[model samples]
Target: GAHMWEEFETLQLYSRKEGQRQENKNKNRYKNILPFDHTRVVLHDGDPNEPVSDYINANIIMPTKKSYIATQGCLQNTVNDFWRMVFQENSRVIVMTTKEVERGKSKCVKYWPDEYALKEYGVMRVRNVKESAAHDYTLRELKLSKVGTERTVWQYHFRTWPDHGVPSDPGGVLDFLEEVHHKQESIMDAGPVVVHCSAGIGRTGTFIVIDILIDIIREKGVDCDIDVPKTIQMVRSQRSGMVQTEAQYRFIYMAVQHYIETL
Candidate 1:
């Protein structure tokens, strides 16, 4: 069983690397970086045309060197807006979905080659994660299709979902975070990672917070030192309305706290 786990880990690492390579190939289409002010959050009245002055105070700047990942549902309505905000910022946006893009269930009806856009913006590369450990065929095709390419984007489709309502397996989610951290470490010169899900909260927050906790523990070599309250507060400060349900917040706190106590 130990050997099998090791083999699985090896294959997982290879898959992530393959995805990264594919991302690098289409870097030129992306812009180098946008002005820091471009990241501001805009507030509008109910009419969608009126600007509201009284708003939540937060900066919308991109992650600095640190990896930033988020989750979203569909790309049909928000893809253009997301692209417009992130394209020129040189940030790599990974679109994670339960269904394949080619499938009819995909939120994106039409495809916009992000790789090409990255290249046009002087970005040397852009990475995409199309395959998850939860997906069988997606993973196989991602690994086999672009192995030797230097400019290919990296995408991993793995199956780690535990149930219908749950986001992913606790152990598997930890493993995935470890893999992402490894990638961030390897890219010593790259900017912050842009991770997203459908709404950029809930599942996305869980993943990011867990990753942060892991890094803090590993780098500090301390256990049971995570500041759960502060972490959640920090996240909320950025987006006044985040982590919709109270149960989701509790889950993240308990999950990280439980892991810390175990360590």
Candidate 2:
């Protein structure tokens, strides 16, 4: 018969092995290697009417919605996660990306040859690249009709290259995003916009903060006391202390403050 100590040791070893197995399984899920600085931010709710955040409310904007934020990871690894979250309640989603068409095709809910293609497949629309050579694949191969039609998914092309590093044209990028926000505003009933970059956190966080700040200004006006720093802190509090890098955090504050001063 085994002693109590022996039984305890056996159980401990088995548990340790199981944990290691799970860890290995997770590690193998990624196709490309990512830096240690990378992080994932996921938000979910039991009730579609529940607030996603004080600054942003999912229930109000997208009554039945959930979202996933990933930094420097394969979209395939994240697609299922995103699908599951939205499937729990919502039926539609808006996706954004910095990756080319091939990569995007691997992750999208559906793809179309042209805007007309959407009508047949029930896909809302496909947004493609307007300038960046890295993402040009979206426009080069796909053909679109001269007369556009309304669809569930709509693809908007944005031009910005960060391969060398963050673009020198911060003002230009801001202007482009303003246009995007304007376009999105007209389609308020469309659903939640899914935003992503090669690494979701760096550029992704920057984009989200800028958009949020813009909305704050538009709604409350400059005189109101909207705690932008505290707003970011709240995001970090929920998402494993997100906005990890000093540059990223500073960029968001500087961008908002710059807009405020200008206004």
Q: Count the backbone clashes (under 3 Å) in each candidate.
A: 51, 9
TM-score of each: 0.53, 0.52
Model 1 stretches astray by more than 4 angstroms: 1-74, 77-87, 92-153, 156-158, 162-164, 167-169, 257-263
- Stretches > 4 Å off in candidate 2: 1-151
lDDT of 1: 0.39
Candidate 2, residue 6: Cα displacement in angstroms equals 55
Q: Write the per-residue lDDT of candidate 1 for residues 16-128, one digit (tens) a residue.
A: 22112332222211122111122333323222442322121112422213645343432443333333333333333332423333334342222233322332212122333
The local lDDT score (0 to 100) that residue 221 gets in candidate 2 is: 80
**How much does candidate 2 score in TM-score?**
0.52
Predicted candidate 2 versus true structure: per-residue lDDT over 1-263, tens digit per residue: 00111211221101122212332234222333222222222234323563321111011111112233333323433333333333332323333535444323432223334333322211122322232233221222222221213233334434453443454435644665565566556654644555545444456556665666667777778666655455554444323223445555556555666666667
